[model samples]
Target: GSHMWIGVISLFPEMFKAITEFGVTGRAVKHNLLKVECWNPRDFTFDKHKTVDDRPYGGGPGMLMMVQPLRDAIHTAKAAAGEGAKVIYLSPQGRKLDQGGVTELAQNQKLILVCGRYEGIDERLIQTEIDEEWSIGDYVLTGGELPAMTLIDAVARFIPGVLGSFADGLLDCPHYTRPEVLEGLTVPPVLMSGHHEEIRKWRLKQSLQRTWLRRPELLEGLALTDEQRKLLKEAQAEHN
Candidate 1:
């Protein structure tokens, strides 16, 4: 089977080089489990200046991306993606990216990401061409490149063999390397113990408790098993 393909359409292709350089995402790409291709919209422009944007129609603020060039760039990228390619546009007026969204995107064989700039791309281009809109958060950014990188990194974790022996669904437990103790904080006692059941229980409890404290919304949507429900109830009691 082919590794998932991520095609990025951006004005600054060099900005994406950072994702291919180092860290978890880098390793995934190096191992051939993931492929990232950059498509510069300017490449599609015929003008000597390779213009991709222009003054907004009907008079507004910042320049808007010229529809034809971007649409052409996206179509070219989509053709490369083959069948069932999903077109995702990074923008502010889009569904907020979350864990579930990441999981869904990871399952796709190909993703064509549109990176918008200036005031934004023309509404007509987005409405008729793009498949879905995804936002990293509520805040505004100078460009969509950062948000695209973030989405790629999040989705990559769900790919098989990307994390090395680690289960894709398992959120890693608090990890401690060689030194054993950092400052005054020590590795949790269960992690060091030889008891497998105890270690598993401790990890599950910690994962649940941490999620409850930090991101309760995730818990609300999750369908908890009887055991998990009991564990959460116990955790809540302990906190009270």
Candidate 2:
């Protein structure tokens, strides 16, 4: 609540309800560790229609969000968020979000996220006020609401107790609960052996191998330990 705050500027504040009321994000709100408040640009609009978007200049296919209402809402959020608050515009053209970025954002005490509607927001507003831009992935979406929620979930993982005391930062290893053998497949032997050291190593090995196969590019920048390198080499041989 008071410690960290996430202020969102959007046309539809209701979109934030799901995130503010569920899971780790919800727990953060419940425990007063963080607070998520939404500001609707339409509410700031003096227009009778509660307008937030208008035709783009130079004849664009879709409307662009107007500057004034959005600016007002963002400024309001900025004030409430206080100092050390970084405003992020969620857009497809922005920096691609990754685990590294999520961890970086989690350390922030306050964040203001602008969720653009229509084709985009006015260039002038973005240049004047936004601190940085962030995108969830390569594709475009109907609105920035989902992208904002995605950022919250990813960042909240690093917050204390968000993962419910499960603190390993790496991607999770495969898990099996019961039925020693299921669908003709058996649980990993090391997991059932009660060998803590082996289990730890086994989990890391699986994480490394899975990441290598699925997102090989991620492995490029990571510095592997001697044991990790050995496991990767073994995994590579197995694949070939």
Clashing pairs in 2: 1-32, 1-33, 1-34
Worst 10 residues of 2 by lDDT: 163-172
- Tens-digit lDDT track for model 1 on 1-240? 357799999999889878887888899899988899989999999989998888987998679888888999998998888889899999989999978788788888889899998889888887888999999999999999999999998888888887761232234556566677879878877778989999877777767777788778768867887877888789889998
Using Cα atoms with residue i matched to residue i, what is each candidate's TM-score against the true structure?
Answer: 0.84, 0.90
120-228 in candidate 2: lDDT tens per residue? 9988888999989999999989999999999987877666655661232345568788899989999888898999999988888888788788878778867878988
Clashes of 2: 3
Error of 1 at 47 (Å): 2.6
Residue 99 displacement in candidate 2 (angstroms): 1.7
Off by over 4 Å in 2: 165-171
What's the true lDDT of residue 101 in model 2? 86
